[PDB]
Design a protein around this ligand. Structure first.
Ligand SMILES: [K+]
Ligand SMILES: [K+]
Ligand SMILES: [K+]
Ligand SMILES: [K+]
Ligand SMILES: [K+]
Ligand SMILES: [K+]
Ligand SMILES: [K+]
Ligand SMILES: [K+]
Ligand SMILES: [K+]
Ligand SMILES: [K+]
Ligand SMILES: [K+]
Ligand SMILES: [K+]
Ligand SMILES: [K+]
Ligand SMILES: [K+]
Ligand SMILES: [K+]
Ligand SMILES: [K+]
Ligand SMILES: [K+]
Ligand SMILES: [Mg+2]
Ligand SMILES: [Mg+2]
Ligand SMILES: [Mg+2]
Ligand SMILES: [Mg+2]
Ligand SMILES: [Mg+2]
Ligand SMILES: [Mg+2]
Ligand SMILES: [Mg+2]
Ligand SMILES: [Mg+2]
Ligand SMILES: [Mg+2]
Lengths: 200, 147, 98, 50
RNA sequence: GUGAAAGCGUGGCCUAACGAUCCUUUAGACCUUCGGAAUUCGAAGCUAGAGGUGUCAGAAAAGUUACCACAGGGAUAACU
RNA sequence: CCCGUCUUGAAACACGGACCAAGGAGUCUGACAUGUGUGCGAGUCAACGGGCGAGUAAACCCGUAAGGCGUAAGGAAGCUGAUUGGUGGGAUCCCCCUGAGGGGUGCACCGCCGACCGACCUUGAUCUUCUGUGAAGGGUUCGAGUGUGAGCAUACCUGUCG
RNA sequence: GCGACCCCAGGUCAGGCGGGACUACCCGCUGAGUUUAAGCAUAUCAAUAAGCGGAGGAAAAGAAACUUACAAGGAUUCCCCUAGUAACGGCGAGCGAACCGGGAACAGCCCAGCCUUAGAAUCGGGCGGCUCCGCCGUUCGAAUUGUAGUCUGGAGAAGCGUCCUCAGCGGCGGACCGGGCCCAAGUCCCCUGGAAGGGGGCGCCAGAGAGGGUGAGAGCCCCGUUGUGCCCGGACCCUGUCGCACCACGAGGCGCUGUCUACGAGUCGGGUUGUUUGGGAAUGCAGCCCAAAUCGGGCGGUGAAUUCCGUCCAAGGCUAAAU
């Protein structure tokens, strides 16, 4: 070792040459996955190629709680609120997740509205052609039925907007930094304050 | 590019540029960072002060997400406002633009630099520094706390 | 308690209308039917008590509650299970006395 | 055995920035419009109308 | 501290008399942390010393080989 | 005086070399670094993947609040978080006169000294949820900081290291 | 002495199953040192090589006794990032994950236990039939020390309403795969050559100028190549249509309930020892000792006590795809 260089820490002391993974098959993998997707689309025709509907869920942890993404499946509470029996939802293209809990009204209401939109946009063929049942669609709707290729219900964020508002005296007399400092102090000293209150 | 390698220029010069006396042997000073305290001590001390020893407390299973806190300076707040909103704010002095820095991925607002002259700005953020709040108040704006 | 809407202090976080969790069958994991309790009581009558349970009962009869808890902790491994076992022995002793 | 036997994990491919690729494409398209350059590249364009 | 005072005193009239990392241990704060929330033990941190490396810029270390082996050295002995 | 080599010193009573043909030794890869070329620029990088497409391992296109690096630092940590300079030299340019002249201009870089952020110390009017805030005022202390960004990608030589 | 059962013994008894072979990937066990640390013992090499076993076309894993602390995600697997990071380390040499986030693919389920008792409703063998991968009849046997059915925590049982859903067959095609047959154009004139497939001239085909052969650089001499057409066979799976009977006892779906609501033990957990891990007052595994509970139990990355809070439900089992 010589000169002023960063201290090296290369992890190459084992038989690493026997565990090298190359990517010469990357185009082949892409082609194989595309072929599988095409075969699946042909198989499930006329069902949408994007797959079953998924719920809207929040991101985990403080880093992503402002983000909205797709969850595994709709909760039992959401299905009950939307009037869709849980045993029927999977058969009509709705994913079901019996594990997800509903802690707030906003998420439950959002997913219920999503399910209602899907129901409004859903067309169901009868099990037997000559027999029409409660959940089946009319012949006119069935005739104009096609396979949807892309995502039929994109999960998108409401883009930010900067509006002009009046600055009132109440806002001009608010000490944000002082509020933050006092809240931090209260959080730090809650235990001591409770102990003193209990003692006295 | 082999044809540009200097060993090609050294073909026919015996030592290949590594000297007749010293030569190019396998590991004359040990492997890797060997001898950091004994025969490579001068190099470590002069170029890598602080290398040896330990300081501070440990933190088992430390997750960086709970420490996430992007910051933006007040001198960059105006750049977030779209051009049409900037024009509207310039035209009308009875209202101020309302910038939610959280929608742009910022948690805390710091107080480096200055704002546009004679422009009131309403800023909403999770946290703010005392200087940033003072500058916003002086500009005629206000600060709103969110989460 | 609802979130304050602040990022610091007590009850911090984004403001949402909190919803009580819907009841689910898993709320009864620690409970069992009356038949299971009856069967366990009958089998306890048939099979009696283990030697260390008898030792704990003797210690409680003498009045050495601390020694009984120490013996229970040594036998079972944890303070919580030792406390539970000592309480059960005390209940059995109370039933015997009455 | 040869010295330093060749291995498959040699860096065969290159990752050129998209902007530079587009620059090169635009330059080639512009050069295709210069008759002198087209002649200089070996094409017989003496009879093309324009 | 001393002297009336100027002033002198940050060890010995001057030129030698001594010691890193890691660990342990002591002193200091109404100090920081134990990461779901509190209190208390315990533990972990911050600043300054102490336990030592005398091969003294600081491995943890007994012989024998005539049964012997290898890489070298005329940088080095045993002739001329 | 016989070349090659080690050597203070080789024509050496120093070692290799009987002769010829062919083969024969600083490479590839990963992490950095300076330098240079190229693109863009407070941004930069589509090749994880997706849409396709020379009927196609290429080329082309695609970044939603994705991610990496950069865009803010100082503290073990709790935590706090850049008030936006002055001055001596100095390139170029503009005026008066033709002296090694005078005036204005004063980028790059260098020297010196302030100011701001943070660790530590010190300091304390007013408010305040009583432990927080911070008018004024600081320091022979400490920093890989600030004071109108300079990075990201990529190519090659060279250097350290596995 | 007979009979019933239990345990066991002999059968070339009737009918079945198993051993062994291969190595690129896969699963389990066992297990070094060279080497690096400029010496060396912990460490590193490496949870690797060697050794001993077990599968498939993939294996393994898999439906939370999970991740987290958020406005919360939601089986398993893999890729990018996290990250050369948290952590570990004679804190030396070195070593080094996971969660979130973005993508590929997606799929959920089966049991044990209280619940037929107006009768084991279950299953195997022989024999005889049938539209024979199975169905029916009869007869022996297994099984009450429990085969069927219901139930699996997401629930569920029971009761009452709603009238919402549920019952095959055969034909012809499409889709997938594997094959067979035919189909363009010069071998014109001159020269050199042993031989034109070379040079010059004159023509032609081209959705065919990929490639090969033939006496030298051959699109048009031959096989082929491009694009049509026709023909044959598998896979009984997916899909469209057509022809006929289409029976809701019963079982599910939805609503209600002052009733119940059964959930895996020498197992969890604890002490200690050894090994391993980034896992640090101890990450997993294993031996030995102790040894649970049901308003309870595991986890919440610093040991302990107290009070709360969050999250799941182990000690039984199956499961395609992304790799
Ligand atoms: K360097
Ligand atoms: K050199
Ligand atoms: K030399
Ligand atoms: K520590
Ligand atoms: K003195
Ligand atoms: K020494
Ligand atoms: K020896
Ligand atoms: K030599
Ligand atoms: K010689
Ligand atoms: K970016
Ligand atoms: K500090
Ligand atoms: K039978
Ligand atoms: K059963
Ligand atoms: K059960
Ligand atoms: K279970
Ligand atoms: K154990
Ligand atoms: K619990
Ligand atoms: Mg050297
Ligand atoms: Mg000392
Ligand atoms: Mg981002
Ligand atoms: Mg399997
Ligand atoms: Mg990084
Ligand atoms: Mg993920
Ligand atoms: Mg039979
Ligand atoms: Mg010839
Ligand atoms: Mg032909």
């Amino acid at each position: 070792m010589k000169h002023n260089n960063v201290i090296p820490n290369g992890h190459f002391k084992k038989h690493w040459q026997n565990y090298v993974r190359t990517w010469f098959n990357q185009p082949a993998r892409k082609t194989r996955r595309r072929a599988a997707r095409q075969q699946k689309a042909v198989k499930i025709f006329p069902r949408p190629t994007a797959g079953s509907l998924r719920p809207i869920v929040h991101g985990q942890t403080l880093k992503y709680n402002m983000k909205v993404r797709a969850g595994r499946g709709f909760s039992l509470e959401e299905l009950k609120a939307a009037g869709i029996p849980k045993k029927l939802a999977p058969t009509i293209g709705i994913a079901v997740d019996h594990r997800r809990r509903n802690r707030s009204l906003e998420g439950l209401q959002t997913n219920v509205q999503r399910l209602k939109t899907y129901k409004a946009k859903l067309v169901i063929f009868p099990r037997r052609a000559k027999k029409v049942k409660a959940g089946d669609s009319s012949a006119e709707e069935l005739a104009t039925a096609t396979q949807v290729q892309g995502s039929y219900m994109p999960i998108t964020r409401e883009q930010p907007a900067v509006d002009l508002v009046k600055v009132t005296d109440e806002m001009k007399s608010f000490n944000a930094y002082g509020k933050l400092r006092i809240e931090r102090t209260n959080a730090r000293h809650i235990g001591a304050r409770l102990k003193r209150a209990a003692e006295a | 590019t082999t044809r540009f390698k200097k060993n090609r220029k050294k073909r026919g010069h015996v030592s290949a540029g590594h000297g007749r006396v010293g030569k190019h042997r396998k590991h004359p000073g040990g492997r890797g960072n060997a001898g950091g305290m004994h025969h490579h001590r001068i190099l470590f001390d002069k170029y890598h002060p602080g290398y040896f020893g330990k300081v501070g407390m440990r933190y088992f299973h430390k997750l960086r997400n709970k420490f996430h806190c992007p910051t933006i300076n007040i001198d960059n707040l105006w750049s977030l406002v779209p051009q049409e909103v900037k024009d509207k704010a310039k035209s009308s002095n009875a209202t101020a633009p309302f910038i939610d820095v959280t929608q742009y991925g910022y948690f805390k607002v710091l107080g480096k630099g200055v704002l546009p002259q004679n422009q009131a700005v309403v800023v909403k953020a999770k946290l703010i520094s005392k200087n940033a709040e003072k500058k916003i108040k002086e500009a005629g704006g206000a600060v709103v706390l969110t989460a | 308690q609802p979130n304050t809407g602040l990022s610091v202090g007590l009850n911090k976080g984004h403001v949402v209308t909190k919803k009580e969790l819907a009841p689910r069958p898993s709320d009864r994991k620690g409970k069992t039917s009356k038949r299971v309790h009856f069967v366990r009581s009958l089998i306890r009558e048939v099979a009696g008590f283990a030697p260390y349970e008898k030792r704990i009962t003797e210690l409680l009869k003498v009045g050495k509650d601390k020694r009984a808890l120490k013996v229970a902790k040594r036998k079972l491994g944890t303070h919580k299970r030792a406390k539970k076992k000592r309480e059960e022995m005390s209940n059995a002793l109370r039933k015997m006395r009455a | 055995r040869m010295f330093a036997p060749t291995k498959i994990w040699r860096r065969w491919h290159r990752k050129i920035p998209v902007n530079q690729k587009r620059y090169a494409v635009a330059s080639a398209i512009a050069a295709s419009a210069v008759p002198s350059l087209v002649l200089a590249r070996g094409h017989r364009i003496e009879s093309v109308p324009e």
